[PDB]
Paper text:
Here we describe efficient routes starting from validated parallel and antiparallel peptide assemblies to design two families of α-helical barrel proteins with central channels that bind small molecules. Computational designs are seeded by the sequences and structures of defined de novo oligomeric barrel-forming peptides, and adjacent helices are connected by loop building. For targets with antiparallel helices, short loops are sufficient. However, targets with parallel helices require longer connectors; namely, an outer layer of helix–turn–helix–turn–helix motifs that are packed onto the barrels.
Author numbering: -1 to 55, 58 to 225, 228 to 309
The structure:
Amino acid sequence: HMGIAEALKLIAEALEVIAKALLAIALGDKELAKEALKEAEEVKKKAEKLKKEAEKKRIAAALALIAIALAVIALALVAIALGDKELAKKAKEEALKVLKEAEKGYKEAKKQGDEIAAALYLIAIALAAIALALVAIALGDEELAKKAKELAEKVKEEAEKRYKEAEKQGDEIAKALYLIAIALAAIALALVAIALKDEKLAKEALKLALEVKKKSEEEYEEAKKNEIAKALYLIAIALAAIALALVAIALKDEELAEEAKEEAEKVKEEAEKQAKEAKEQGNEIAKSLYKIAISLAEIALSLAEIA
């Protein structure tokens, strides 16, 4: 309850560091990169702290690890911004450590039958593939991009199958979290297409993002008649807009970049509206998630202007 809210706060903070690290890449602004770097290690330390507390007491532990994975992603971006091979190699170590913690926590969450914690660990696995995809870009590592690609395909196939089993359980939060995982899988694929200069894989990631976008939009109005599953469907839509912008970057397509930017503006409006409503009614976890959705729309806009 309280440990969940601390984790969501940190996840929001890390998303702000990622937005800053992204802008530093666009502008070549190294002061911005050093700044984000200090913020991302502050976040990772606080997140590494909350992960021990929640384990020594499960949903907040996976949320703490998500924050760690998001901090590691900001590290990989800063390494791209500064051209720092040492930092990239540090991000590689940090990401594999996340991948190990998220594979173990995912394994026992399926045995224990904890559907939300499993969906949350599966998300952290997808975050690890994203981080590895960025380390591949920084280092020029083809084999690491292939490792990332194979990771993202496993997440996709398993999130799709576990999503249909959450439809048969009436677990709408897990249904949203598995949609988010498929959206993160599309993000990892567009990054690997960028890293490999691969056009067929970007066309693949594009078909995947459009599938998630259509499904998350439908599930969002269905949930509108939860308030948490509602905000999670919005996050999924924001994450799909991020993948569209990435494919607009990888294919050098401007109509796709305009379409990605227009969806990001649409989600932002809806999230601001919903967050206003959740604030007045005291839906603190929902307000947190709508906050997270605005952050993701901001990241999508950054990429959309880079394209």
